[PDB]
Amino acid sequence: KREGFAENGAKAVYDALKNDRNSYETRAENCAKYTIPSLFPKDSDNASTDYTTPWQAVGARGLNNLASKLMLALFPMQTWMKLTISEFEAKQLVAQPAELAKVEEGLSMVERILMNYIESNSYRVTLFETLKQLVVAGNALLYIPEPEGAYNPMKLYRLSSYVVQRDAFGTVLQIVTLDKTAYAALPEDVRNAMDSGQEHKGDEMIDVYTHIYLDEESGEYLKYEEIDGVEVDGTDASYPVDACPYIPVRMVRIDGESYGRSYCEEYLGDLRSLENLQEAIVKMSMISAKVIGLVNPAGITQVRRLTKAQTGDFVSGRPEDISFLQLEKAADFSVAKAVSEQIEGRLSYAFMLNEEIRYVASELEDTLGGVYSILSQELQLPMVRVLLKQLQATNQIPELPKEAVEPTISTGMEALGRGQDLDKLERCIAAWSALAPM
Amino acid sequence: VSNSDLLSIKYVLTKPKGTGWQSVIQFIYENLDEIGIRNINFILPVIQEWNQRNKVGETTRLSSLIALKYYQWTIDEDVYLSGRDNEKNILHTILHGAAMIKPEMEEVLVKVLKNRWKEHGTPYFDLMTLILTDLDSYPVWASLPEYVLQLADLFWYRPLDIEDEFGLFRSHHDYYPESPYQTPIYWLLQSQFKKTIDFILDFTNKTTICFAHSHFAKNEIEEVDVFIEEGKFIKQYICNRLWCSYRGTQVSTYLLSSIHMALEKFFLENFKNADSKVLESWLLFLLRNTKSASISAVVTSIVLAFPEKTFNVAKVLFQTKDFFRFDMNRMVLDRTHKSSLINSLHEEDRIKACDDVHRNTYLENLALHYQIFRSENVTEKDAIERQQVLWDIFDKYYNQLPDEAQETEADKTWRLCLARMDRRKMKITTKEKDEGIEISFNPEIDPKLKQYSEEAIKKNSEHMKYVTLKLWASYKREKDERYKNYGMYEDNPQIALQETKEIIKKLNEEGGEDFRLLNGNIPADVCSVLLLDYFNQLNNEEREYCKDIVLAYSKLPLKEGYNYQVQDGTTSAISALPVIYHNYPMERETIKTILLLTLFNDHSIGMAGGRYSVFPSMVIHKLWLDYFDDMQSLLFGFLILKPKYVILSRKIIHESYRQIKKININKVFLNNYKHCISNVIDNKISIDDLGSMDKVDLHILNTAFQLIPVDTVNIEHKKLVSLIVKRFSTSLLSSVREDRVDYALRQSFLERFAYFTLHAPVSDIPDYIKPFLDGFNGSEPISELFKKFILVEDRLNTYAKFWKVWDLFFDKVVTLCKDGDRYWYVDKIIKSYLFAESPWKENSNGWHTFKDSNSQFFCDVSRTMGHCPSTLYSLAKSLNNIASCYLNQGITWLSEILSVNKKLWEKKLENDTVYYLECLVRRYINNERERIRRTKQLKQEVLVILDFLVEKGSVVGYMSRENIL
């Protein structure tokens, strides 16, 4: 029988903690409704309601743009990590230049193996999706698998699938996930595990609960999986506190809370007002019972023939010289447009759709260096620690001295000569030469 | 670029010379068995640099064959080639020569299609990906289009975010900024028209059926009967998301968007002078075969673009009713989308497309236009026949309308739509104007329907009632001179106040959600505007009303359950408190209480790390001039009381578990600490009454630090500042991780410290920076300190004080580089000290803090720190832009460093070091050519740098020597 956090079972802790998650889920639902509803859908009356498409496009476009820029401060194609050498150990290893060459070539192959693992297992994809979840809901959870086969991308969980509990210092005490799959689809020994009780139908969904919890007599997190309050045998495992494969992530940091907060909560009133104006402009167009226009070249084609009483008669003219006032005629149109421009100004600034020092030092650098560094803390550093330990456990990289070799992320900026040589010059030449006429 | 001198051209671009290139490439190819395919790794840059410029001929065949053989070897050995999308890679060498290796390419494609190798890690996967994504693949698209179509069919479709419902792989976001240039389709249409049209129709039908049966679509998708010929109808799926696919104005798949954009662009570019019979036959072919309305939208767009060529297609479109509804929705979105826009290859094409002339029109305008206007090729007999056709269509629509008691508003909308088109039932009137002649067309209208229209128009004007006041107050708040247009509220403060009283009544009398959403913040902004800008014109009754509203809105952040949103009106109200405090002495106790309780709010705002306590801090800074004792009582009161509020918060939370929003924490706090709060109100606190700062948290100390004026001369302020700096520097300089300070807090502290130091007298500066001089080490906040000093000096231009600070740190930095710049953050510290880390503008003549005298700084630096490679990098980068005024002397400094420190010729360098040295030497020679020729010493000094560049393989260095010699 279990002890401590696990005493009552994984399902009991999930039901116990779920009460606290409701406000954060409600906030996420409201943010999704005015941006991209399929990022966090929760409406129940799907016999009547769609994943309702807004009239305003600004929310969706701004979210995609922000995630694209975050996925370029973070995780670029160039080198973003450093396996540092402890200076005390460097002062020992300097005894031969050949050994320093071999050791730093070793670290070079390990750094290349890390970036190899990042690109070859296409982590760039799930990281882009994770950033979308962080922007709209403030919270996300990732899992890094033990390697099998040729190709091992990660798994991402939305807030509605998990619970987490934290102390006064933000430390993770325990995590529970709720996972679901049909009875007939499960592994054969799992299908054999449920002969007793109710008769399962082949498509009956089984609720599986994963529990990860902190130990005290050991420096470890402990893991097991659970169905109907009974442990699934063989699913048990243990991990040291420095290298657990489950990674919960926050967009913003608050003390005394399990969870973080989203960015666009501050701006939901603007989005909700912009939609309200656009709908009225549509109605203002539909109800109009009169049409008004103008002929452009000073009336040198004689429109008097239209004022003369004959429907079967025609003016000489073109769409090149005729236009109509079909929305601009309406009396309140100009002011509704003007307020829409003000609201879009605030939103487009907020989603970044925009003395010898350049003032991008504020908005492209200082504004992001915070979230960039905090995601280095809560996302990148745990990930590289797990990847290094997995590569050692699979014998792929050597057992180098832990006193010497330690990771770090180099947040910042890359060189620029190669950059203009490719982007401004040769890619442009490729485009220009390919696009030239027949 | 117009000139032909390598010393003056903007960029240097080069190409091969001589028959050695052909000889070497041929000799490698003929003897490849004796050398062995593993060993030829040295030839890859040669074949790369040839194919980059020469794309026909024998040598281009051999180069491409060598690259292909090496790739196939890596496949057989399972060895990895680093996926990095680089112009210099091997696969680009294959693609640049693909016109010369067509049989070999065809064999590779046949094998891929035979084995269905469509998944990551199978053979040839990277090259196939490029053929579907990259513009350099265009010789393949020209040579083998029938295979490219099959490859796209294999790679894009996944049989059963919204792209999952369409049945597509999530590699799809390779196409993210959707555009006609994202896929090979635009070129396959030129290469193989009929087969590409077949492909587009098949792929669209599959994909739309996949979406239509998803749970996603269930309450958005409609189905409509589409007329084709007499008695002939077909069904199509339709909604706003499908109709607008070719515009990008709706949230839909970037791949499908890009395909439909390419189709529209091809028809608009290439059929512009076509025979009408050809053009109309293809548009009708597209209508007959699609199961998706997203094609019908493209057909409609082309009919709107060429209206006098395409009447026989327009005749078919007018006979399907629902196309009028969706095209009108498109027109309203097109008339706004451009503003929301307002990868450059794609984005300029989007911006230009928003300027297309034909986007302004829509099907109602076209139906009226054929009844009125005659162009140069159309007879009166033709126009008479056009009228007869349209009138038969209108009569057949009128005959189908329901009995009038049955009507819904959709029917009334359709009847109004018909009234805007049928010329038989209209009057005409005209007015001449500066731009031409205005025409008004006046339909003759049913009284029941007329009354419906009048009611709806009125209701709109009832909703939009206060929008002009909202506009005026917002422009006035933001100091945007567009407020001057609104002379009905400018020069009219009492009108604004009267309408504000209407709004306040409506809010109190059970105001609804739709009303409060748009109008709920107008009283706050109007009252703050009147108090800040019009106080001399108001009477005392008007002043007191404005006061009561501003003080009411200022208290809302003190209620439980408040959440901040950017225009809720509270920050507008808080900004007007200085005027009230100045004018009304009875309010001061209330305002001191409001400010104190709001400083305790730690909730963050934005992404940059600010907090809500900024808003009362801006008020306090406006009061230090006249009300010093009151504000100092707030400062000492905060430092005493804030550590107690957090303990009481924890107690209330704990008792809410024992038995949170149930309890008004502020009312409890105000009842417990009445004695100390009375000392705050009566101004009876001093710097002697504070405790020692030894255990107070750094967030609290920073919050106090931001309230003190940066140019203060007060003894108690200076004494308090001196405590805070020692406390912070102890934590910043530590190597123990447990001491580590948050990034945003660290930036916030260091910039304020720079302001305090540079406003000081010149003899006090050595006492300000002393905790950082004594504790100096290799840790990262030393770099951040130097960057913040450079920033504040650019703002302030305090020449002598900046150079005193820089002269005091010199010996410490010199001592640090002797350990070697690879340790801890030493190289970053060097680069920061030597101006290389800051973001300077692109074409600076110099800097206002550099003068002739200061050249001795760089002389000492190059004499003393030359061996650290960070020094060479920093000098070369600086002399190229911000320190450009010292160039003639910089050549000496660089030449000396390279001549003495021989190990630099063998060590590893920082990125772009060679690039900056190339730019510098090339810029100097163009100015100084005759003096370099005539003077021995200058020529030797330049040749040292050129020999270094040639040792590293620089072409520009080599050519420069051949010029100078």
d(CA B723, CA B713): 16
Interface probe with B: pick from A326, A373, A374, A418, most Cβ of B within 10 Å: A326
Residues 26-45 of A with CB under 8 A from B: 36, 38-39
Q: What is the resolution of this structure in A?
A: 2.9
Indicate the DSSP class of residue B227.
Answer: E
Cβ distance A316 to B374 less than 8 Å, yes or no, reads yes
The packing angle between helices B799-817 and B781-796, to 10°, is 160
How close A197 gets to chain B, by Cα (Å)? 33
Structure determination method: cryo-EM
Q: Which residues contact A69 (CB under 8 A, 6 or more apart)?
A: A352, A368
Cα(B732)–Cα(B741) distance, integer angstroms:
7
Which helix (H) or strand (E) element contains residue B670? helix B665-672
Q: Which residues in chain A are closer than 8 Å to B791, comparing Cβ atoms? A: 357, 361
Helix (H, G, I), strand (E, B) or coil at B605: strand
Neighbours of B213 (CB within 10 A): 13
Cβ within 8 Å of residue B173, ≥6 positions away: A128, B254
Mind spelling out the 3-state secondary structure of chain A?
CCCHHHCCCHHHHHHHHHHHHHHHHHHHHHHHHCCCHHHCCCCCCCCCCCCCCCCCCHHHHHHHHHHHHHHHHCCCCCCCEEEEECHHHHHHHCCCHHHHHHHHHHHHHHHHHHHHHHHHCCHHHHHHHHHHHHHHHCEEEEECCCCCCCCCCCEEECHHHEEEEECCCCCEEEEEEEEEEEHHHCCHHHHHHHCCCCCCCCCCEEEEEEEEEECCCCCEEEEEEEECCEECCCCCEEEECCCCCEEEEECCCCCCCCCCCCCHHHHHHHHHHHHHHHHHHHHHHHCCCCEEEEECCCCCCCCHHHHCCCCCCCEECCHHHEEECCCCCCCCHHHHHHHHHHHHHHHHHHCCCCCCECCHHHHHHHHHHHHHHHHHHHHHHHHHHHHHHHHHHCCCCCCCCCCCEEEEECCCCCCCHHHHHHHHHHHHHHHHHHHCCC
Residue of B181, B847, B915 lying closest to A356 (CB–CB): B847
Helix axes B743-758, B781-796, angle to 10 degrees: 50
Q: Which of B496, B591, B567 is nearest to B534 (CA)?
A: B496
Lookup: tokens for A350: 């907020």
Reference B670, options B695, B691, B645; nearest CA is: B645
Q: B-contacting residues of A 49-88, CB under 8 Å? A: 49-51, 53, 55, 57-58, 60-61, 64, 68, 77, 87
Contacts of A62 in chain B (CB under 8 A): none
The tokens for B2 are 């117009």
DSSP character at residue B253: -
Closest CA to B105 of B80, B72, B134: B72
SS3 state of residue B793: helix
Q: Quote the radius of gyration of chain B (alpha carbons, Å).
A: 38
Q: Which residue has the tokens 């950033």?
A: A131
**A269 contact residues in B (CB cutoff 8 A):** 517, 565-568
Check residue A231 and give left, alpha or beta (phi > 0: left; psi -120 to 50: alpha).
beta
Extract the tokens encoding A152.
């091992």
Residues 6+ positions from A166 with CB-CB distance below 8 Å: A172, A173, A257, A258
The span from the CA of B648 to the CA of B35, in Å, is 81
List, in order, residues 6 or more apart from A31 with CB less than 8 Å away.
A40, A136, A137, A262, A264, A265, A268
- What residues pair up with A324 in beta bridges, in sequence order? A293
Name the nearest CA neighbour of B816 among B791, B834, B792, B798: B834
A48 touches chain B (CB under 8 A): yes
Query: Measured between beta carbons, which residues in chain A are less than 8 angstroms from residue B441?
Result: 290-293
Residue with tokens 């962080």: A134
Strand A172-182, strand A162-166: pairing: antiparallel
Q: What is the three-state SS of B734-754?
A: CCCHHHCCCHHHHHHHHHHHH
- The type of residue at B708 is I
Sign of dihedral through CA atoms B80, B83, B85, B86?
Answer: negative
Among A263, A318, A431, the residue with its CB nearest the CB of B375 is: A318
Q: In the block, which residue shows the tokens 């309601």? A: A49
Q: Which residues contact B868 (CB under 8 A, 6 or more apart)?
A: B817, B820, B821, B827, B830
Q: How far apart are CA B295 and CA B260, in angstroms?
A: 8
* End-to-end alpha carbon distance in chain A: 78
Which of A356, A367, A409, A425 would best serve as a mutation to test chain B binding (most B beta carbons within 10 A)? Answer: A356
Bridge partners (DSSP) of residue A240 are A220
Q: Which residues pair with B237 in a beta bridge?
A: B223, B292
Query: Strand, coil or helix: what is B480?
Result: coil
Which amino acid is located at B709 in the chain? P
Q: Give the number of C-alpha atoms closer than 13 A to the C-alpha of residue A438, restricted to the C-beta side.
A: 9
Closest CB to B565 among A268, A355, A366: A268
User: How far apart, in whole angstroms, are the C-alpha atoms of residue B245 and residue B263?
Assistant: 12
Q: Which helix (H) or strand (E) element contains residue B223?
A: strand B222-229
For residue B436, give the amino acid letter.
G
Chain B residues whose CB is inside 8 A of the A64 CB are 176
Nearest residue on chain B to A271, judged by CA atoms?
B517
Q: How far apart are CA A101 and CA A367, in angstroms?
A: 40
A412 interface with B at CB cutoff 8 Å: no
CA-to-CA separations, A427 to A419, B67, B133, B186, B344, in angstroms, rounded = 11, 21, 14, 19, 12
- CA–CA distance, B667 with B544 (Å, rounded to integer): 27
Chain B residues close to A68, C-beta within 8 Å: 176
Burial of B765 (0-12, 13-18, 19+ CB in 10 A): middle
Q: How far apart are CA A360 and CA B19, in angstroms?
A: 50
8 Å CB contact between A109 and A117: no
User: Chain B contacts of A317, Cβ < 8 Å?
Assistant: 373-375
Closest Cα in chain A to B882: A356
Q: Closest to B219 (Cβ–Cβ): which among A50, A286, A361?
A: A50
Tell me which residue of B124, B140, B133, B187 sits closest to B156, measured CA to CA.
B133
Using CA atoms, how far apart are residues B181 and B262, in angstroms rounded to an integer?
Answer: 7
Residue ranges of A 285-344 with Cβ closer than 8 A to chain B: 285-299, 303-304, 306-307, 311-312, 314-319, 322-324, 326-327, 331-332, 335-342, 344
Full DSSP string of B117-177? --STTSTTHHHHHHHHH-GGGHHHHHH-HHHHHHHHHHHHB----TTTTTTB-GGGGGG-S
State the Cα angle at A276 between A274 and A282, rounded to 5°. 105
Contact by Cβ (8 Å): B957, B922: no
**Single-letter residue type at B151:** L
Task: Tell me whether A352 touches chain B (CB under 8 Å).
Answer: no
**3-state DSSP call for residue B321?**
coil
User: In the 8-state DSSP scheme, what is residue B491?
Assistant: T
Which one of A49, A58, A266 has the shortest CB-CB distance to B340?
A58
Pull the structure tokens for residue B708. 């003190």
Task: Select the residue from A305, A332, A346, A429 to test the B interface by mutation, using most B Cβ atoms within 10 A.
Answer: A332
The CA distance from A417 to the nearest CA of chain B, in Å, is 6
Strands B373-374 and A315-316: parallel
- Quick count: other Cβ atoms within 10 Å of Cβ A137? 25
**Cα B707 from Cα A51, distance rounded (Å):** 49
Shortest distance, CA A390 to any CA of chain B (angstroms):
20
Among positive and negative, which fits the CA dihedral A341, A345, A346, A347? positive
Q: Angle, to 10 degrees, between the axis of helix B588-599 and the axis of helix B674-682? A: 120
Tell me which residue of B605, B608, B553, B597 sits closest to B576, measured CA to CA. Answer: B553
State residue B522 phi and psi, 5-degree precision: -60, -40
Which chain B positions have a beta carbon within 8 Å of A133's beta carbon? none
Record: contact B437-A299, CB cut-off 8 A: yes
Specify whether the CB–CB gap between B487 and A326 falls below 8 A: no
Question: CB-hemisphere CA count at 13 Å for B785?
Answer: 22
How many CB pairs below 8 Å do chains A and B form together? 280
State the CB neighbour count (10 A cutoff) for residue B388: 11
* CA atoms lying within 13 Å on the CB side of residue A281: 29
Nearest chain A CA: its distance from B420 CA (Å): 7
Name the residue in chain A with its Cα closest to that of B336.
A337
